[PDB]
Amino acid sequence: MEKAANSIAKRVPLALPEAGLYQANLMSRDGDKATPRMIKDLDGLALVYPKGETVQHWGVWVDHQVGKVETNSQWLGQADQKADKDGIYPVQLIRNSERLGTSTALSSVTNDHNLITFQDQPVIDLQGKEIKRWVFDFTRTGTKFSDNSPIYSGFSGHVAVTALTTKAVTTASWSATDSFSSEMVGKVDTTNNGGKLTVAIEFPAAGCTLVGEGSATAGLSKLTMTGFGKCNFKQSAAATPIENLWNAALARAMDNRVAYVTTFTADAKKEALVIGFPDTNGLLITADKR
Ligand SMILES: [Cl-]
């Protein structure tokens, strides 16, 4: 009876997890009524941005490699908060997935289905243990590439999220898993001076450094970015399809652009910086302490 459920879903802004940083796990499911199981090594990040007065954004990013082939995906969600003229609360979902090997593939698909989040869902974690989690249903933005090859082997289109413990941003030096000066993002420098937060992001290809100011906080700290006038964000060939998407958004960005930053610890007790630019074609910067 999904159509009836979606009909009600439309009448209220989309239910999302509390604003913050999440771990995402791509799941497999065997049947429309079977319990989804997380898939090894198909983990990612998800970010729910704070609720706007008009819109709430969120995103999910996943990077996976097999052989010499990378498959990178981002899902970008926009949930309207105010009502539409038909009394509806629009939801928009976009998947961009790129497959980079000897050949190249990009698949981008939007869908405006409303009932795409599920709260307290049973999920078989990586140990075979059933647990409960928010679940995204990204089935309608597709799971295959055009040659009938699946984007991620076993992926059902369902995505579990788990809240990550985030520290506040400290004064430190970071690196977006990079490096010559040809990459999209390079050094990232953060200063936390008694709560006042400044973040400097070098964009080596664009030839500029963006600087953001904000206030330190547990979870997401809101930044206002400047520096865009000094940058050349163009469509490359040196960039991946998704990077060119990020470039297209950054080329239209202007001073006082909003971003959110937080830190957390990954596996080997190694801290990571995450900066997310809402409504910027999925721009997500992750950086290792250095
Ligand atoms: Cl489900």
Side-chain angles (χ1 to χ4, degrees), residues 1 4-6 8-32 34-36 38-67 69-81 83-84 87-119 121-125 127-177 179-180 182-195 197-266 268 271-290:
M1 72 190 306
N6 184 263
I8 288 86
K10 289 173 177 166
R11 255 201 301 137
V12 64
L14 174 71
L16 290 166
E18 174 170 13
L21 179 65
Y22 291 81
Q23 177 175 311
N25 290 90
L26 300 193
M27 287 183 302
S28 63
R29 128 182 300 184
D30 187 42
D32 304 51
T35 62
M38 302 175 177
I39 297 180
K40 186 178 194 310
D41 296 337
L42 273 189
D43 56 337
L45 261 15
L47 205 43
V48 180
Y49 291 108
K51 196 179 307 299
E53 199 75 36
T54 258
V55 113
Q56 186 177 23
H57 298 277
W58 76 97
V60 178
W61 297 266
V62 176
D63 315 287
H64 187 60
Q65 174 165 349
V66 309
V69 178
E70 314 170 14
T71 298
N72 307 318
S73 299
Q74 55 182 23
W75 290 261
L76 305 166
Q78 179 176 315
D80 273 25
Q81 298 299 295
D84 153 72
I88 296 185
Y89 290 88
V91 170
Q92 180 191 83
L93 183 58
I94 305 173
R95 184 190 47 65
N96 314 109
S97 306
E98 63 188 6
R99 182 184 64 188
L100 318 165
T102 65
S103 298
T104 310
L106 169 62
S107 160
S108 300
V109 168
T110 76
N111 185 266
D112 59 350
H113 201 66
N114 281 78
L115 186 53
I116 60 172
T117 68
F118 296 84
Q119 192 159 357
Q121 292 301 305
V123 163
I124 303 170
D125 80 326
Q127 324 302 314
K129 169 203 287 178
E130 180 167 303
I131 194 126
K132 297 221 286 182
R133 288 298 191 284
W134 281 83
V135 165
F136 287 105
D137 172 359
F138 293 160
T139 58
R140 292 163 192 79
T141 46
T143 54
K144 299 177 182 170
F145 280 113
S146 67
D147 49 26
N148 209 29
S149 168
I151 305 185
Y152 303 110
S153 179
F155 185 45
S156 81
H158 294 90
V159 182
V161 285
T162 305
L164 293 178
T165 61
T166 59
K167 306 89 168 176
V169 175
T170 60
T171 290
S173 203
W174 318 73
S175 173
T177 92
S179 283
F180 235 104
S182 185
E183 202 96 67
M184 162 125 199
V185 180
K187 284 176 268 285
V188 179
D189 288 321
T190 59
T191 308
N192 183 337
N193 164 253
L197 203 59
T198 61
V199 177
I201 313 175
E202 92 172 349
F203 289 84
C208 75
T209 290
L210 295 190
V211 285
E213 295 182 311
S215 305
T217 298
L220 306 179
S221 306
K222 195 187 199 166
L223 302 173
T224 41
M225 307 300 305
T226 58
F228 292 102
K230 303 172 295 176
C231 307
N232 195 10
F233 295 109
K234 54 173 179 36
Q235 299 302 284
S236 309
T240 79
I242 293 183
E243 281 170 353
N244 275 332
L245 284 181
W246 296 352
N247 286 327
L250 287 159
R252 306 170 210 130
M254 262 156 30
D255 280 352
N256 296 323
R257 189 74 174 216
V258 175
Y260 290 90
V261 58
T262 185
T263 74
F264 73 104
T265 35
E271 266 205 4
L273 186 74
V274 182
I275 307 168
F277 288 70
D279 198 24
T280 312
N281 288 351
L283 173 61
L284 178 81
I285 300 160
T286 64
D288 297 320
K289 213 155 174 165
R290 134 188 163 258

